[PDB]
Each structure stands twice: as C-alpha cells, then as structure tokens.
C-alpha cells in the first residue's frame, strides 16, 4: 500500500516525468486502444487515429489528473472524488479497464525513462496506479 | 496467436534482438519485486528480501533465462502454442500449483521489460502484437487447469 | 469440462430440476445489481435503476432465460463446449465487446443462485463440479478473443 | 464502497448468521478446497478431509474475524492490522485466493439463509468481503 517509501518513490518518479505527463498520457491511451481494442468502446465520439487531436487532448487531461493525485497521496478519495462519479455512474467503466490503462502507462514510462524506471520505482508506481484505480471505481462497489 | 503475416514478421524480428538472460533475469526479478506473493514459489532461491537481493540472485537470473528460452519457443511456434506448452501446462498445474493469473502478470511484466530495453522501437503496434503473444502463451500454460 | 462419469451424472441430474426462467432471470438480475458496470450492455432494457426495477424488468427475465437455455446446452454437450459456443463467442467479442472477465462473474453468480434455490442438496462436491462447468463455459465464450 | 446503506445491510445480515458464523466459515473452506484445489496448498499441515477438526477449528477463527470486522466497519485497517501482516508477510497468500474464499462464503450463506440472501443483501456482502480482502492484502502492495 502507499507507505512513505512508496510516496517518496512516486513523487520522485513523477518529477522526472515533469512536463511530458500529457504526452505520456496520450501515448498510453494509444497503446491501450491498439493492444486492447475492447477499450475503444467507451470512445465512439473520438477520432482514435494515430495523432488524433482528441486523443492528445484526452492524454493531457489524464496526465493532469495523475499529476493532481501525485500532489495528494494522503487523500486521493477527496482529490479524485469528482472523477469517481463520472467513471462509476456516468461512464460505467468496467474495472478491468483501469488495469489495462495502468499497464499501458507503465509501458510508456519504461520506453521514455529506462534508467529511472528501476524495479523499486516500478513497484511504487504500480501501487500508485492501483490506488488511483480503486478510487475511480469506488462509487460502484 | 492470430496475427497477420507482417505482425508475425515484426514479432520475430524483435526476438532476434532479445538477450534471453538479460531480459529473462530482469522480467523474473521485477515479477518477484512488484508482486511479492510470487516469492513463495521460489523459497529455494535464498535471499529474495529486497530489490537488490532479488535482482542480483544468480538463481533468479538462471530461472528467468529458462522461462524466457521457453517463451522464445512459443514465439517460434505461434501456430501451435497449445502443443508447444502442454507438458509445461501440467508441471505448473500439477506440481507447482501456480494460479494462471500469475502467467498473465509475468507476460505483462515481460512486455514492460521489452519496452524498457527497446525504447521507441517498441512502438504501440509492436506492443499490441506482443500482447497477443503473451496472452497466447498465458492461455496455453493455463490449458491444463481447464 | 473434464469430469468423472459420476460427477457428470450429478451435474445432469441437478439440471433436470433447473427452472431456466426463474434461475436465469435471478442470475442475470443479481449480476446487474452486484456488478453495476454490467448495466451498460443493457441500456435498451429500460429502468435498471434499483434492485426492484432490475429484478422485475421483464426484459431482464427474458434475457436471463435465453442466457440460461444456452448454458443448459453446454451442460448437455460437456465434451464439446468449444464448438457449442463458437458462434456465441464471436457475437460477444465482435458485436457486443463484453470483457471475458464478465463471463466468469456471471458463472459464479449462477452458482450462488443454484445454491440459494437447492440449499443443502447443493453440496460442496456438487458445487465443485459446477465450478468446472461454469469455467468450461466461460473459456469457450472467451475462445474467440484469444 | 461501504456506504451507510451497505453498513446497515451487512450488520443486519450478520445478525441473521448469528451463532453459525464458525460453522459457515468451515463450510465455506470446504467448498473452497473442493472447488479450487490450488488453495489446498497453503494447508499442508491440515487434515482437509470432510469433517476434519482442524478445518472446523479454522472455520471458527475465520468466522470470528468476520464477526470482528462487522463490529468495526468504520475502521477495518486497525481491527484487521494483525491479520494483514500474517497473510502478506508470513503466508504470502496470492490475492486471487481471497476472491475464491469470498465466493465460497456467499455460496454458503445462499444455502443456509435463502430468504435473507436478497439481491441488495448479496450486493452489500460482496462489497464487505471485498473490503476485508483488500485490508488483508494491503501489507503486500
Ligand atoms: C488512470 C486512470 C484514469 C484517469 C486518471 C482518468 C481521468 C479522466 C479525466 C481527467 C477525464 C476527463 C473528464 C473531463 O474532461 O471532465 C476522463 C474522462 C473519461 N475517461 Fe477516464 N481516466 C482514467 C481511466 C479511464 C479508463 C480505463 C477508461 C475506459 C477504458 C476511461 C474512459 C473515460 C471516458 C470515456 C471519459 C470521457 C471522455 C470524453 O468524452 O471527453 N478513463 N478520464
Ligand atoms: C511465461 C510464463 C512461464 C513460462 C514459459 C514458464 C516456463 C517454465 C520452465 C521452462 C520451467 C523449467 C521446468 C523444468 O525444466 O522442470 C519452469 C519452472 C518453474 N516455474 Fe514456470 N514459467 C512461466 C511462469 C511461471 C510463473 C508465473 C511462476 C510462479 C509465480 C512459475 C514458477 C515456476 C517454478 C516454481 C518452477 C520450478 C522451479 C525450479 O525448478 O527451481 N513459472 N517454468
Ligand atoms: C454464461 C455466459 C453467457 C452466455 C451463455 C450468454 C449467452 C447469450 C445468448 C444465447 C444470447 C442471445 C444472442 C442472440 O440470440 O442474438 C446473448 C446475447 C447477449 N448477451 Fe450474452 N451470454 C453470456 C454472458 C454475457 C455477459 C456476462 C454479458 C454482459 C455483461 C452478456 C451480454 C449480452 C448482450 C448485451 C447480448 C445481446 C442482448 C440483446 O439481444 O438484447 N452476455 N448471450
Ligand atoms: C475472508 C478472508 C480471510 C479471513 C478473515 C482469514 C482469517 C484468518 C484467521 C483469523 C487466521 C488465524 C490466525 C491464528 O490462528 O492466529 C488465519 C490463518 C490462516 N489463513 Fe486466513 N483468512 C482469510 C482468507 C484466507 C485465504 C484466502 C487463505 C489461503 C487460501 C488463508 C490461509 C490462511 C492460512 C494458511 C492460515 C494459517 C492457519 C494455521 O496454520 O492454523 N486465509 N486466517
């Protein structure tokens, strides 16, 4: 769980991501839409082609929400409260799907920061994406 | 495990560049670090107490290479995973008692390791092909539990 | 889906007593109640807003019966699930886009409903046979995603 | 998540379980060992035969810990803190296994309280067993 050591790794790792959070969030969606095509189902209204401006715009929102969560590890439930309602009540996103996106975001971070993506940092980031996924599916069950 | 002949060609071309010991040792070590309950299967390997003990244990690297060499065999026999791994399917179910969910975790950790090692060559499309391969392997090892 | 001829006989004997509409409507309704994201596939059924709207919607009961009748067909063809559900496997992957994990949730909700209806006749051994059947069905519907 | 309505259903449902909690905990283990035999792996030192006294004794401990959790829904992490250490550090129980046991415990409650095991009560009890499973695997990741 998010232990102090995990909070320290996650803050340090996100400082290295720095200004690429939105570009990494866009790349992660892309790998998710190509590797796990059932996910494309929640985005009928998007142009999902490589480089669509919408995906790029949505990659920035996801990237900013992760940057917000990193700033409030002590209280993700209140920082992401509004996103729980949307994903649970409004979008009815199948929980398996947060796992696929988390996997795609770790893959993207491994591509771009190979030297910073150490085993201990990979373990803390997985716990973090798991905590964020739990808050977003909390309003369900 | 239902790929275009060009996707298959891209898959095989990357495997020509895979160092099975470096990638295998890293994939297995990261599994043991990231999903800690997986360490109970490897009691006999000795010190697995912290990331450094884990990434440097020679027993982890050698087992990672064996696991990866076997994976490389399913890559070279994509039209026949089910038969390539049947005997391996019975060892894991019968003797090791590994839950099949762990085959999927390892497949994904493998994908994250290929990304780390190939960087931008490990494109979104190449990653999508590899997700079909790791799922193809995870289901053929899981074929004897079913 | 790898059963003793006596386990198979116990499985079939229970199915002689299954009311497919009562059990099917209840299994599907409980799925929709207990795992709420499953309601997005059934937008066209109308009011699914609370447990009573859900358990009483005639659309839920009729679909539950169809799903259960089809399940009853895999029960009568345990030596051939894969072929019994191939066409159903493509509908769910291709047209419905249902994640395969939901097939496992429904199979388990079905088991909980059989327990509720048969009580102490639904022994631990009979439940173990049924877990092999629901997993056998969940994997044949999931056979075309793989 | 455990909303007040879920806490009210869980307390009411556990009052109906009353004194059979240990006998239901023993039956649930039995259905779990027969339906999902990989689980038998954590109990080499037990006699797992139908009616073993050990399984019956362990069914009582599990039943009592659930009865404790039902008394502390507002704070499961502190009430079950000691059980998190054991399952995560000492036993290294694969998290998939809490799901199988939760399923087996719901099956057992459906057998014995068919009239009380309503769809809304089944939904609250699932959320509860999920919360209890999360606390017990928290000390991992
Ligand atoms: C790390 C996990 C996630 C985070 C932080 C996240 C964050 C967000 C954010 C910040 C928004 C934008 C809301 C707005 O613009 O008001 C959003 C919208 C949305 N997300 Fe999530 N998301 C996550 C995972 C997912 C997953 C796994 C899916 C489905 C596969 C998904 C599907 C959607 C959809 C369909 C929308 C509405 C988009 C639109 O119509 O513009 N999200 N998400
Ligand atoms: C990609 C999926 C996997 C493949 C291809 C694979 C392949 C293999 C192979 C080739 C061996 C050597 C067997 C022998 O020569 O007797 C082996 C053994 C073993 N594997 Fe798997 N494996 C996989 C996943 C796993 C997972 C996820 C675990 C546990 C978390 C696991 C645990 C073990 C153990 C404990 C042994 C025996 C170790 C020993 O001999 O010291 N494997 N596996
Ligand atoms: C036990 C596993 C299942 C079986 C045997 C099964 C079987 C069936 C059958 C026989 C039909 C009728 C198809 C037709 O005649 O065109 C159907 C349709 C459908 N099923 Fe499945 N199903 C299963 C699981 C699921 C799950 C878990 C979901 C979603 C959560 C799902 C969603 C649907 C939908 C949305 C349709 C089309 C509905 C309509 O025609 O209004 N099914 N299924
Ligand atoms: C609802 C979930 C669970 C609860 C509340 C729970 C509770 C407990 C309790 C109260 C103990 C006794 C400790 C003592 O006597 O000091 C225990 C021990 C143990 N449990 Fe868990 N348990 C749960 C799930 C599991 C699962 C899923 C497994 C593995 C499949 C498991 C395996 C064990 C083992 C191996 C022990 C030690 C038993 C012995 O040697 O006597 N438990 N559990």
Domain ranges of chain C: 1-146
Q: Which CATH architecture has domain B1-146?
A: Orthogonal Bundle (1.10)
Beta-carbon contacts of residue C108 (< 8 Å; ≥ 6 apart): C134, D103
Round to whole Å and give the CA distance between B62 and B58: 6
Technique of determination: X-ray
Of the candidates C81, C123, C103, C96, the residue with the CA atom closest to the CA atom of residue C35: C103
A106 with A32: CB under 8 angstroms?
Answer: no
C35 sits in which H/E element = none
Q: Please choose, from the candidates B74, B98, B96, the residue with its C-alpha nearest in 3D space to the C-alpha of residue B85.
A: B74
Q: Which residues contact A49 (CB under 8 A, 6 or more apart)?
A: none
Residues of C in contact with D117 (CB under 8 A): 116
Q: How many CB atoms lie within 10 A of CB C76?
A: 11
C 1-40: CB under 8 A from D:
29-30, 33-34
Taking residue B132's Cβ as centre, other Cβ atoms within 10 Å add up to 18
- Is the CB of B1 less than 8 angstroms away from the CB of C146? yes
| Number of domains chain D contains | 1
Q: If residue C92 lies in a helix (H) or strand (E), which one and from where to where?
A: none
Which residue puts its alpha carbon closest to atom 19 of ligand 4?
D87
Range of the domain at A73: 1-141
Closest CA to D84 of B45, A136, A102, B36: B36
Query: Ligand 1 center to residue A65 CA distance, Å?
Result: 9
d(CA A56, CA C1) in angstroms, rounded, equals: 46
Report d(CA D71, CA D73) in Å as an integer.
6
The DSSP line for C36-84 is GGGGGGGGGG---SSHHHHHH-HHHHHHHHHHHHHHHHHHTTGGGHHHH
Q: Which residues contact A5 (CB under 8 A, 6 or more apart)?
A: A124
Task: Report whether D127 contacts D6 (CB < 8 A).
Answer: yes
Q: What is the CA radius of gyration of chain B?
A: 15
Q: A140: domain CATH number?
A: 1.10.490.10
CB A104 within 8 A of CB A31: yes
H or E element that contains B30: helix B20-34
Sequential DSSP letters for B70-124: HHHHHHTTGGGHHHHSHHHHHIIIIII---THHHHHHHHHHHHHHHHHHGGGS-H
Quote the radius of gyration of chain D (alpha carbons, Å).
Answer: 14
What is the rounded CA–CA span in Å between residue C134 and residue C139?
Answer: 9
Q: Which of C117, C36, C25, C65 is nearest to D117 (CA)?
A: C117
DSSP string over chain D: ---HHHHHHHHHHHHHHGGGHHHHHHHHHHHHHHH-GGGGGG-TTS--STT-HHHHHHHHHHHHHHHHHHHTGGGHHHHTHHHHHIIIIII---THHHHHHHHHHHHHHHHH-TTT--HHHHHHHHHHHHHHHHHHTTTT-
D12, D21, D93 from D86: Cα distances, Å: 29, 22, 9
Ligand 4 pocket test, pick from D54, D67, D93, D106 with the greatest ligand atom count within 8 Å of Cβ, gives D93
Atom of ligand 2 at shortest range from CA of B68: 5
Helix, strand or coil for residue A52?
coil
User: How far apart are alpha carbons A55 and A76 in whole angstroms?
Assistant: 25
Q: What is the DSSP string of A70-126?
A: HHTGGGHHHHTHHHHHIIIIII---THHHHHHHHHHHHHHHHH-TTT--HHHHHHHH
CB A46 within 8 A of CB A54: yes
């Amino acid at each position: 769980v998010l232990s102090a050591a995990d909070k320290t790794n996650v803050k340090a790792a996100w400082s290295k991501v720095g200004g690429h959070a939105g570009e990494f969030g866009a790349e992660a969606l892309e790998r998710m839409f190509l590797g796990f095509p059932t996910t494309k189902t929640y985005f009928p209204h998007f142009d999902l082609s490589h480089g669509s401006a919408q995906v790029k715009a949505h990659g920035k929102k996801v990237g900013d929400a992760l940057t917000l969560a990193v700033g409030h590890l002590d209280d993700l439930p209140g920082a992401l409260s509004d996103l729980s309602n949307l994903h649970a009540h409004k979008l009815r996103v199948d929980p398996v799907n947060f796992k696929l996106l988390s996997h795609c975001l770790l893959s993207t971070l491994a591509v771009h920061l190979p030297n910073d993506f150490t085993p201990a940092v990979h373990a803390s980031l997985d716990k973090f994406l798991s905590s964020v996924s739990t808050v977003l599916t909390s309003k369900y069950r | 495990v239902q790929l275009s002949g060009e996707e298959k060609a891209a898959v095989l071309a990357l495997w020509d560049k895979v160092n099975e010991e470096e990638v295998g040792g890293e994939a297995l070590g990261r599994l043991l670090v990231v999903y800690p309950w997986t360490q109970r299967f490897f009691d006999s390997f000795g010190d697995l107490s912290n990331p450094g003990a884990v990434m440097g244990n020679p027993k982890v690297k050698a087992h990672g290479k064996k696991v990866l060499h076997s994976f490389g065999e399913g890559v070279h026999h994509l039209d026949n995973l089910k038969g390539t791994f049947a005997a391996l399917s019975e060892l894991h179910c019968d003797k090791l008692h590994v839950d099949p969910e762990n085959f999927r975790l390892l497949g994904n950790v493998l994908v994250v390791v290929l990304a780390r090692h190939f960087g931008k060559d490990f494109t979104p499309e190449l990653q999508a092909s590899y997700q079909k391969v790791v799922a193809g392997v995870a289901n053929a090892l899981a074929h004897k539990y079913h």
